[PDB]
Amino acid sequence: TIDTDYDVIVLGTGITECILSGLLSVDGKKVLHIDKQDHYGGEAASVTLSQLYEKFKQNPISKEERESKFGKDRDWNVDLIPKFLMANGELTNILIHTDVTRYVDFKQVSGSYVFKQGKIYKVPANEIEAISSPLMGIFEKRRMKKFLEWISSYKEDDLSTHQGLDLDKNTMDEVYYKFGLGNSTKEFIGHAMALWTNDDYLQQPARPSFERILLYCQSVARYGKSPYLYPMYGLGELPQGFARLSAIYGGTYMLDTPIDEVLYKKDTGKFEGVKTKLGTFKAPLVIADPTYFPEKCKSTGQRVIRAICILNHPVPNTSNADSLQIIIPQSQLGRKSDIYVAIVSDAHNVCSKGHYLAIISTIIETDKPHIELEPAFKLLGPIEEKFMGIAELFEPREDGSKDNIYLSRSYDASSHFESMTDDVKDIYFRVTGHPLVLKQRQ
Amino acid sequence: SEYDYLFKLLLIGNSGVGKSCLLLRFSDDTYTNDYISTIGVDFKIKTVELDGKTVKLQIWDTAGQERFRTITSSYYRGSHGIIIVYDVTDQESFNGVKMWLQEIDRYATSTVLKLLVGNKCDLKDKRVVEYDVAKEFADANKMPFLETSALDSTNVEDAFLTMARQIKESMSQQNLNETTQKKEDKGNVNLKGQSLC
Ligand SMILES: Nc1nc2c(ncn2[C@@H]2O[C@H](COP(=O)(O)OP(=O)(O)O)[C@@H](O)[C@H]2O)c(=O)[nH]1
Ligand SMILES: *C/C=C(\C)CC/C=C(\C)CC/C=C(\C)CCC=C(C)C
Ligand SMILES: [Mg+2]
Hints:
CATH topology of chain B: Rossmann fold
Oligomer: heterodimer
CATH architecture of the largest domain in chain A: 3-Layer(bba) Sandwich
Strand content of chain A: 15-25%
CATH superfamily of chain B: P-loop containing nucleotide triphosphate hydrolases
CATH class of the largest domain in chain A: Alpha Beta
Order of helices and strands of chain B: EHEEHEHEHEHH
CATH class of chain B: Alpha Beta
Shape of chain A: globular
Number of helices of chain B: 6
Strand order of the largest sheet of chain A: 8-7-16-17-18-15-19
Bound molecules: guanosine-5'-diphosphate, geran-8-yl geran, magnesium ion
Largest interface: A-B, 43 and 27 residues
Largest sheet of chain B: 6 strands, mixed
Distance between the termini of chain B: 35 Å
Strand content of chain B: 15-25%
Number of helices of chain A: 13
Distance between the termini of chain A: 32 Å
Structural class of chain A: alpha/beta
CATH superfamily of the largest domain in chain A: FAD/NAD(P)-binding domain
Number of domains of chain B: 1
Number of strands of chain A: 20
Strand order of the largest sheet of chain B: 2-3-1-4-5-6
Helix content of chain B: 25-40%
């Protein structure tokens, strides 16, 4: 009694696939969404503490020992892949248009800190903090102020606001030169505001950097304190909310359902459907994460180490903040990639009272990945427990137009979700042939 | 407008037992024969007067996620009461209640209130789950029991009012205070509010 025909079959319930499922169902498409796993979230799921031990430890501890040290398993929602939301980012725009805010609550992240020579400093979130910050000297702050005034008064359609600069012809380094900004200021803007993980952007057209810096400023302006929001109960609430949106608009969901076989149109290599323990389902195209079609994906060459740490106290030198980001610019450690730390606690309902979660991550560049994180571990003070893992980043070999197999990218090392929504918009364009246009749900 | 307490209620149970029709009968006073909706019910808000107090209820429905049992932690967040529904003409739907109780034990708070509802009681000729058997099971699982009919309205309003009373009378003073209008703001942000560049 299960329909065999659908407009779209989606495999894996990571957030990229769940947003696409919700949007396609809202568009009126008949969607079948299947996951071989017994829970939502895919690689960016939030898991309980017992699940964290099963996944990262050799000999998981007993329930009695776990509860005496950490409390009830239900108080824990631990992200496997850390991500914050820019307050004015595209995911917030999708959340408001789809009303998925009905299924997920958000709280501000207290602040973002940048590392400089062994110490961390809170990045300003208002003018009083900007005046107080020792990150820049008095004369350099005056130049920085002119640069920020240009970021806000710039209007694409009005050449008189460009101050002689062209975002497509000029490189970001040329933009810095026009404002006379020194190297330390370039590092702060590039790594703390644009959030680039290295300095390659200096020799590239300024446009993408300008957009990222403006996004940061607009995000801080939304609620103050920092440019980020974080969901109550963890990132896993997001794929679950979009899966509910898809279900409301007609989507059909199956979990714990392996794909016995992918079916292809005779001699064409084009997707036709899937065979499962519940039957065979057909659709002209499939949307899926790399774990369903490893042969159709390739490594980007990057491996990311993620160290999930549990603390029984606030992070040192953060004024007892309930949540924060720490950015360690690669220039401060002679590295090729920045190291990030994402910190949340019971204020966001991700762990029991008194504990903090600090997830450290970076792109691996040495033979001893654990040692690359030592500068970040040192910022946390005593660590109760560490759950370490290394993930390789994959991307599709092709865009799916030739085989109707539209694949998402592995979740990357960036500290927030803008690159994930870029993947959602790109996949949507590949699947439908036109750009995503959000409609306000009634 | 103003209310004394705001509660979050959920409906749960096997596909086809009448959860969506029960909610529509309580919220809109309507019933559609052979109900089929392209867009599923999300939730309904209803304010009732309960023993002198104004109680606002946000009642959630499953959006069909129970078809292949794909409802997880998100649906149960912040829930105060859960109404478990079965169909008195479907033995398997009653057997399914044991599994739903295990899901509630896993995802909801240990203090969540529960109510058992045997729906479609208008189908007198096709009843297979006897009232006494269901009542004994409800007593064994610490929950009140009512047989309802979204079709003819039997006990529908009373099932939701019974759950609202269960919550209001069972909550600790601290938990009840958290549902008052004065404590509605939990410190979360409103993504649609005006900016504070
Ligand atoms: N006879 C009868 N049919 C009912 C009753 N409630 C719901 N139904 C029918 O049973 C089917 C499933 O109802 P639905 O509300 O979609 O239940 P759900 O799948 O649990 O949400 C529809 O054909 C309804 O019209 C009831 O009280 N009596
Ligand atoms: C719209 C953005 C606001 C209100 C704040 C965010 C500004 C940041 C992150 C820049 C920091 C600038 C410094 C430290 C330089 C001094 C600049 C002034 C005192 C305007
Ligand atoms: Mg229903």
